């Protein structure tokens, strides 16, 4: 008998995500995180941990956005049509950071589209660049394909919403892989994805000179207790939601 521990955010708020005791099973050591835990915690970060400036300049896609994208018109237009309504009330070209959780071949990693309204690097004396950051706790073979799919999503989203032709290429939106803390086992990819987003909100990347050193982005103890911390957070929210 599966029963829902929490709905986050809880009603009356629309768009709440159900988390069941079965979803809590994936937080035990050695288990692969599932999409419910990822999507829950990323919504928790934006609703409770992100600064108010970061919320306004950021957008976090559902973990199904990239899977849906890659499930007359060109092939790029055909992919975009599948997710065209997922930005119904969002102008991603007015955001600084667009977060895309990627699950390819049972491995989580994170793409971050940065300053898509810029057309070239600018220094004022920090360096901000239009680019796609790949934040990966292991190594994913599909990275170049992901980056090209995201450039092609941006081109079609731009043409559809801004109604001019704008190219997004390697020279215009370079792909970068910051040096981030890496995994030591075979099952914590999803926990690192969540930690990368958490640490980005606490300490956003604002200098894009390479290499981007993030080796000390967060301490070791926070990642070693994250599974338990997330589980304890869900249990605390469960008791709160029992009261109302």
């Amino acid at each position: 008998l599966v029963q829902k521990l929490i709905v986050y955010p809880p009603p009356p708020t629309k768009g709440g995500l159900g988390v069941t005791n079965e979803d809590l099973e994936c937080l035990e050591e050695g288990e692969f995180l599932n999409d419910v835990i990822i999507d829950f915690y990323l919504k928790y970060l934006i609703l409770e941990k992100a600064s108010d400036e970061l919320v306004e300049r950021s957008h976090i896609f559902s973990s199904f956005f990239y899977k849906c994208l890659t499930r007359n018109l060109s092939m790029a237009q055909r992919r975009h049509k599948r997710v065209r309504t997922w930005t119904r009330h969002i102008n991603i070209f007015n955001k600084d950071y667009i977060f895309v959780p990627v699950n390819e071949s049972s491995h989580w990693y994170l793409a971050v589209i940065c300053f898509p309204w810029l057309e070239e690097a600018v220094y004022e004396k920090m360096c901000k660049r239009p680019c796609i950051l790949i934040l990966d706790s292991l190594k994913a073979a599909s990275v170049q394909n992901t980056v090209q799919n995201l450039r092609e999503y941006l081109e079609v989203e731009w043409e559809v919403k801004l109604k001019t032709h704008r190219q997004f290429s390697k020279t215009n939106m370079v792909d970068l892989c910051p040096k981030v803390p890496k995994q030591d086992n075979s099952s914590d990819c999803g926990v690192y994805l969540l930690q990368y987003v958490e640490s980005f909100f606490k300490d956003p990347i604002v200098n894009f000179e390479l290499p981007i050193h993030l080796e000390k982005w967060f301490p070791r103890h926070v990642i070693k207790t994250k599974r338990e911390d997330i589980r304890e957070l869900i249990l605390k929210l469960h008791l709160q939601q029992q009261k109302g």
């Binding site: 599966v2 709905v7 009603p11 629309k14 768009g15 709440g16 995500l17 159900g18 069941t20 079965e22 994936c26 692969f32 995180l33 599932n34 999409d35 419910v36 990822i38 999507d39 896609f61 559902s62 973990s63 199904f64 956005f65 899977k67 849906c68 499930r71 599948r82 997710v83 309504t85 997922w86 119904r88 699950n103 049972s106 491995h107 989580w108 990819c189 999803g190």
Partner: protein, 76 residues
Amino acid sequence: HINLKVAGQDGSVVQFKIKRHTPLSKLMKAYCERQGLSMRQIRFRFDGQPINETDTPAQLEMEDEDTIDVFQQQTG
């Protein structure tokens, strides 16, 4: 009455007729049944957002020929 599309991961699309104020619960159950899975295994999303059994097309402000996306569980 409006028509809604349910688009699955295998490229298929299934059409449903539903009244603007009927909760989505029975369309979702009919969909899980007709393709053989449980509610606990299928994620329903509209414009990329979670959809709950309580919600009605009116409250989600759906229009005729809108699409609900369905996904199976993801792990990594």
